[PDB]
Design an enzyme around this catalytic site. Sequence first.
Site, PDB file in Angstrom:
ATOM      1  N   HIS A 264     -23.407  20.212  14.645  1.00 11.09           N
ATOM      2  CA  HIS A 264     -22.954  21.525  15.091  1.00 11.09           C
ATOM      3  C   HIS A 264     -22.467  21.415  16.534  1.00 11.09           C
ATOM      4  O   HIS A 264     -23.065  20.705  17.345  1.00 11.09           O
ATOM      5  CB  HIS A 264     -24.087  22.547  14.991  1.00 11.09           C
ATOM      6  CG  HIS A 264     -23.646  23.959  15.216  1.00 11.09           C
ATOM      7  ND1 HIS A 264     -23.343  24.456  16.465  1.00 11.09           N
ATOM      8  CD2 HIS A 264     -23.430  24.974  14.345  1.00 11.09           C
ATOM      9  CE1 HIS A 264     -22.960  25.716  16.355  1.00 11.09           C
ATOM     10  NE2 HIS A 264     -23.003  26.054  15.079  1.00 11.09           N
TER      11      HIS A 264
ATOM     12  N   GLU B 138     -22.773  23.144  19.136  1.00 13.15           N
ATOM     13  CA  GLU B 138     -23.755  23.400  20.181  1.00 13.15           C
ATOM     14  C   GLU B 138     -24.587  22.162  20.491  1.00 13.15           C
ATOM     15  O   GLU B 138     -25.004  21.957  21.633  1.00 13.15           O
ATOM     16  CB  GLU B 138     -24.642  24.586  19.781  1.00 13.15           C
ATOM     17  CG  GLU B 138     -23.912  25.928  19.896  1.00 13.15           C
ATOM     18  CD  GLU B 138     -24.400  26.968  18.905  1.00 13.15           C
ATOM     19  OE1 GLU B 138     -25.553  26.859  18.435  1.00 13.15           O
ATOM     20  OE2 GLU B 138     -23.626  27.904  18.603  1.00 13.15           O
TER      21      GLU B 138
ATOM     22  N   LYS C 144     -29.367  29.978  13.946  1.00 10.03           N
ATOM     23  CA  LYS C 144     -29.456  29.377  15.271  1.00 10.03           C
ATOM     24  C   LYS C 144     -30.847  29.573  15.876  1.00 10.03           C
ATOM     25  O   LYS C 144     -31.839  29.632  15.147  1.00 10.03           O
ATOM     26  CB  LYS C 144     -28.372  29.967  16.180  1.00 10.03           C
ATOM     27  CG  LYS C 144     -26.960  29.728  15.639  1.00 10.03           C
ATOM     28  CD  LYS C 144     -25.869  30.120  16.629  1.00 10.03           C
ATOM     29  CE  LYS C 144     -24.487  29.801  16.052  1.00 10.03           C
ATOM     30  NZ  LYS C 144     -23.388  30.090  17.019  1.00 10.03           N
TER      31      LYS C 144
ATOM     32  N   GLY D  66     -15.682  29.464  22.099  1.00 13.89           N
ATOM     33  CA  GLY D  66     -15.848  29.222  23.521  1.00 13.89           C
ATOM     34  C   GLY D  66     -15.053  30.124  24.448  1.00 13.89           C
ATOM     35  O   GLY D  66     -15.325  30.161  25.648  1.00 13.89           O
TER      36      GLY D  66
ATOM     37  N   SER E 223     -15.829  32.913  13.754  1.00 15.43           N
ATOM     38  CA  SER E 223     -16.361  34.271  13.692  1.00 15.43           C
ATOM     39  C   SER E 223     -16.141  34.896  12.313  1.00 15.43           C
ATOM     40  O   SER E 223     -15.006  35.167  11.916  1.00 15.43           O
ATOM     41  CB  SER E 223     -15.704  35.137  14.770  1.00 15.43           C
ATOM     42  OG  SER E 223     -16.100  36.492  14.650  1.00 15.43           O
TER      43      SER E 223
ATOM     44  N   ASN F 284     -26.309  30.456   9.526  1.00 13.17           N
ATOM     45  CA  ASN F 284     -26.896  29.666  10.595  1.00 13.17           C
ATOM     46  C   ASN F 284     -27.560  30.640  11.552  1.00 13.17           C
ATOM     47  O   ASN F 284     -26.893  31.234  12.397  1.00 13.17           O
ATOM     48  CB  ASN F 284     -25.835  28.859  11.338  1.00 13.17           C
ATOM     49  CG  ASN F 284     -26.427  28.033  12.464  1.00 13.17           C
ATOM     50  OD1 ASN F 284     -27.647  27.976  12.627  1.00 13.17           O
ATOM     51  ND2 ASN F 284     -25.570  27.388  13.249  1.00 13.17           N
TER      52      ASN F 284
ATOM     53  N   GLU G  96     -15.532  24.318  12.948  1.00 10.49           N
ATOM     54  CA  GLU G  96     -15.879  25.256  13.997  1.00 10.49           C
ATOM     55  C   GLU G  96     -14.738  25.342  14.996  1.00 10.49           C
ATOM     56  O   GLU G  96     -14.414  24.359  15.661  1.00 10.49           O
ATOM     57  CB  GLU G  96     -17.126  24.789  14.735  1.00 10.49           C
ATOM     58  CG  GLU G  96     -18.398  24.786  13.929  1.00 10.49           C
ATOM     59  CD  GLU G  96     -19.566  24.370  14.784  1.00 10.49           C
ATOM     60  OE1 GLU G  96     -19.921  23.173  14.779  1.00 10.49           O
ATOM     61  OE2 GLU G  96     -20.111  25.245  15.487  1.00 10.49           O
TER      62      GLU G  96
END
Lengths: 250, 250
Positions: free
Chosen positions: B95, B97, B13, B173, B213, B11, B167
């Site tokens: 996703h 985000e 992004k 976060g 991660s 991804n 996720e």
Amino acid sequence: ASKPQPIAAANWKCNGSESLLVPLIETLNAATFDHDVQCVVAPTFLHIPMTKARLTNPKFQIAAQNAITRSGAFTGEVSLQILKDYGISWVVLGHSERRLYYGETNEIVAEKVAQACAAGFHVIVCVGETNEEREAGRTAAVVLTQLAAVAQKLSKEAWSRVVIAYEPVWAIGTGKVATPQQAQEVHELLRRWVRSKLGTDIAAQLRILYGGSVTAKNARTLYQMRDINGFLVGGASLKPEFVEIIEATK
Amino acid sequence: ASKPQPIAAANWKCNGSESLLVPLIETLNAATFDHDVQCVVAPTFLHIPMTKARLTNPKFQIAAQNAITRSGAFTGEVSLQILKDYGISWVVLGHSERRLYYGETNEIVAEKVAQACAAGFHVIVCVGETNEEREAGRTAAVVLTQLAAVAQKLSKEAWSRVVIAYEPVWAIGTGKVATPQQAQEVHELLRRWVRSKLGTDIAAQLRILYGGSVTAKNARTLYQMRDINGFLVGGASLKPEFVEIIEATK
Ligand SMILES: O=S(=O)(O)CCCSc1nc2ccccc2s1
């Protein structure tokens, strides 16, 4: 005094296909205009590459339909830097559809416009009231609040790359275009406000375009109004008549 | 049962440029993967064209990072049909985000996934709970409700083209790197739910990717977990390191 250079911008919105755009772009390439006019076409991000590769008409610039202020962990979005790197220098920001469906508040729009100007982009900033707001007599309050939020983040110099597009929400895709008087009245209000805050020159050189059910049939009469400097075209921009709309800015 | 075909998805992004992506793409093209694995790269819409024209590794499919259900007056957006016409058959949806910054609710994500599957796309469905939700002991309630929302709109046969990505928003976060154990803890419950609600066959064939991660340092240890079938990689997917991450799914 006299009108600044007119702008004829096409917002293809969320529409397009290679088979559809190829012929359309060829029509644009074969089109010639005898007057000074800045033509703009804003394809979806996915179609910008094919458009930039095929469009050759020197009076045309390519614009993105939106962008975010920063590159990074923003899955699904496209930043101004990414567009700049790709050679895109025009961008539409604050479209009514984004203010309504995708949470773009007056402040968010302002941040976008501010970073776009700082990045050297020519920005077509959209403003406009809804049907309810106009019925309630809040048109002026609404558009001035939208414009003021943006102006507060811009420097005097940034205005040379700023373009305002007034699109009454009740006129978008409804076949109900604003009358020449209705449009002129708002454009005046906008320009007069800009003049009060930024002066004679900036207000005079500012392009304020009308958007909302613009067609080759109603474009000429609208353009003749004193404070209208062109159009932001939606549905009719994906058709051949878009050339006639440009001619209407002569 | 044995693990189904692993997926190594990148991804990118909101990042990318010709100078960055060309070298990376050719690096991916030069790498050879001997095992059965579905590799995926999700460039921004603007970079999908250059990627499609340059990406050659046989194990790769190109995906969009998002999409809306229909074409039309949605300035700035890209629809599933426009992507399909372009030849893009993979798409990432829901996703974190977008759920957090762009207000994509469970219903909005579920509807996007349903139309995506109906359109023939392979969909990487993202789910995940925030730090607050996790601290409140709501991990299961949150992720399963997100999953249930999408599951209700689909038919059993659609799952052959569905992919789930977990996720750990609570980790991302808070700038933390979740352990393979914390990852597996959620993958275990996700597969348990799928096994009981959709069927043993569906659960055994379903790829549940870890979207936290991931780097060449921890990829292998993550894949070693029983219910992890690959990854949805962030920052490291923009580096040559992504090659080793893919190899870690062997
Ligand atoms: O949970 S919060 O709404 O407080 C923060 C969400 C992260 S979104 C953003 N991330 C960056 C990173 C750098 C600069 C500017 C921004 S806005």
